[PDB]
């Protein structure tokens, strides 16, 4: 009697001043699901077509976000902009103007936290991505659809747009939505997944009618509702703080990776969104692949209000010369080096640590690497140029880069597990994985990376090393 | 310095409409003057142009309906950062 999707986003233990904007097709605003909670702006910018059909997409999504019976955030107030015509087609320019309209509205008549849902996609667009970034930096939360072409989301916009929350779709079996050659987009530009198949919601067919629809937009609509609710509880959240919560509250490792192309399984977050039940937050950030130079370098960055606590690297062939943490524009960045040598990925661990400063100590595998007082070691990075004790980083000829943090209310512990293609070691419950690395052994390691709170080392003995922290 | 961009997915392109993006500090007054400059230089060449929208608030710049033939000229206008051909978006 509770639709599968709404049950799925309800956490295992469970118990307004936010406005949600929708850029879509026309809306049937008097539908009983949403009547009185959606304000039609009458902003309209659509290309000519080449009636109940006209508002089916938009009405269903408004319902998923705020519908009385089938909505995620049942008490959410919405505002709609028309940027998609009756055939569900829009333009980049129309979307730019709509986004500009949202900003001007806000300057004229300021309200509270704003969530903008963008249930649409086109090809990669420099200008649309730039506009979204500027709107996000102005303090607005953007939630977008990953796209429906069973493709890398980085090739689409606004899905690839830095700072927007990009959402992919899973079904009742927590498997990625697929329909022949079509299905959910994936990859490193996707932040998480949410229910996106067989989603019951308002049908614009009749004022009380319901229909089941599927899409990365339906999935994005769940995240916008979760986001609206989270901002109601914590109106002061920054976009980075909202993203870290979405990730932290998500169900983890439930998607069967096999559905994605092989090279994309590492890059694709295995997260299905969920509401919070009524701290140190960390996330893993993958870079774009470095390319095949011998001097090629991949760079992974954190958000401005995030701290880079660790930095690891990964190459499928294994031909790599490690990684380093280095300051770029007054911000610690993660840099990975390719060996002679198809290329590498840089893998950052970005965390929300206030009452924290953090510094990098570059030294050889030097005996303690955070020599200071009350200072915790959060991560060990390592690089070399040839191709052939809680506070100390072990290595072989290699240069070490240690992330050292001053966080009086913070405790860290280092856990090792040594044994093969994959070795893992996980932090205990209540602990956050801040650093992940492998010790050099009688096996050539392809690299290491953090998957939620699990440290993964890939090799062709092998030992995984996880640094785990928590507040106290 | 000014660059041109068009959608990589060919069936999604909308030739004849361009988003002209100006350098970040450009004031709305400059965007309008740059757009009028384009129109005038275009007119001198026998081209009709239509300024559909002037942007301000997110990005400075404007939307222009014109022949692609004018891109080399428009790329030479003062304050221009990049120009992007309009393209389609779809309900997902």
């Amino acid at each position: 009697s509770i639709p599968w999707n709404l049950e799925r986003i309800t956490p295992p233990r469970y118990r307004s001043l936010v406005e949600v904007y929708l850029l879509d097709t026309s809306i049937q605003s008097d539908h009983r699901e949403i009547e009185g909670r959606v304000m039609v702006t009458d902003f309209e910018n659509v290309p000519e077509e080449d009636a109940s059909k006209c508002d089916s997409h938009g009405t269903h999504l408004a319902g998923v976000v705020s519908g009385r019976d089938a909505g995620v955030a049942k008490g959410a107030s919405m505002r709609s902009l028309r940027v998609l015509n009756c055939q569900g087609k829009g333009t980049v320019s129309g979307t730019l103007i709509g986004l500009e309209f949202i900003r001007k509205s806000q300057l004229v008549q300021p309200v509270g936290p704003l969530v903008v849902l963008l249930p649409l996609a086109g090809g990669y667009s420099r200008v649309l991505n730039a506009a979204c970034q500027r709107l996000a930096r102005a303090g607005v939360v953007l939630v977008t659809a990953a796209g429906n072409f069973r493709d890398d989301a980085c090739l689409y916009s606004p899905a690839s747009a830095p700072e927007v929350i990009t959402v992919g779709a899973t079904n009742a079996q927590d498997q990625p939505v697929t329909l022949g050659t079509l299905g959910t987009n994936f990859g490193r530009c996707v932040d998480l997944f949410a229910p996106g198949e067989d989603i019951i919601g308002a049908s614009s067919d009749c004022s009380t009618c319901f229909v089941s629809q599927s899409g990365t937009s339906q999935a994005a609509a769940h995240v916008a509702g979760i986001a609206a609710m989270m901002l109601s509880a914590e109106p002061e959240l920054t976009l980075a703080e909202l993203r870290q919560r979405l990730i932290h509250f998500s169900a983890k490792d439930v998607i069967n990776e096999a559905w994605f192309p092989e090279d994309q399984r590492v890059l694709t977050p295995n997260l299905v969104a969920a509401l919070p039940p009524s701290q140190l937050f960390c996330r893993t950030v993958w870079s774009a692949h470095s390319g095949p130079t011998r001097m090629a370098t991949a760079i992974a960055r954190c958000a401005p209000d995030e701290e880079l606590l660790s930095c690891s690297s990964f190459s499928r062939s294994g031909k790599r010369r490690g990684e380093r943490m280095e300051a770029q524009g007054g911000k610690l960045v993660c840099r990975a080096h390719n060996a002679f040598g198809e290329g590498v990925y840089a893998i950052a661990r970005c965390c929300l640590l206030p009452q924290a400063n953090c510094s990098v100590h570059t030294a050889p595998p030097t005996r303690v690497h955070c020599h200071q007082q009350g200072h915790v070691l959060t991560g060990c990075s390592s690089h070399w140029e040839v191709e052939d004790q809680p506070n100390q980083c072990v290595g072989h000829e290699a240069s070490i880069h240690a992330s050292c943090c001053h966080a009086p209310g913070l405790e860290c512990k280092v856990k090792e597990h040594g044994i093969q293609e994959q070795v893992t070691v996980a932090c205990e419950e209540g602990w956050t994985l801040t650093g992940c690395s492998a010790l050099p052994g009688t096996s050539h390691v392809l690299g290491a990376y953090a998957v939620d709170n699990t440290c993964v080392v890939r090799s062709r003995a092998v030992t995984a090393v996880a640094i785990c922290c928590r507040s106290r | 310095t000014a660059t041109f961009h068009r959608c990589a997915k060919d069936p999604w392109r909308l030739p004849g409409t361009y988003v002209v993006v100006l350098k970040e500090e450009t004031h709305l007054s400059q965007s309008e003057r740059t757009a009028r400059r384009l129109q005038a230089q275009a007119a001198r060449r026998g081209y009709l142009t239509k300024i559909l929208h002037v942007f301000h608030g997110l990005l400075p710049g404007f939307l222009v309906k014109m022949s692609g033939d004018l891109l080399e000229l428009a790329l030479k206008l003062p304050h221009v950062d990049y120009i992007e051909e309009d393209s389609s978006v779809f309900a997902q």
Binding site: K53, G88, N148, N171, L179, L182, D198, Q213, S217 | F90
Partner: peptide, 15 residues
């Protein structure tokens, strides 16, 4: 479920 109102699916059972 799949409706053609969402690009680019036709009418198909979903679930």
């Amino acid at each position: 479920x799949f409706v053609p109102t969402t690009f680019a699916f036709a009418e198909a059972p979903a679930x």
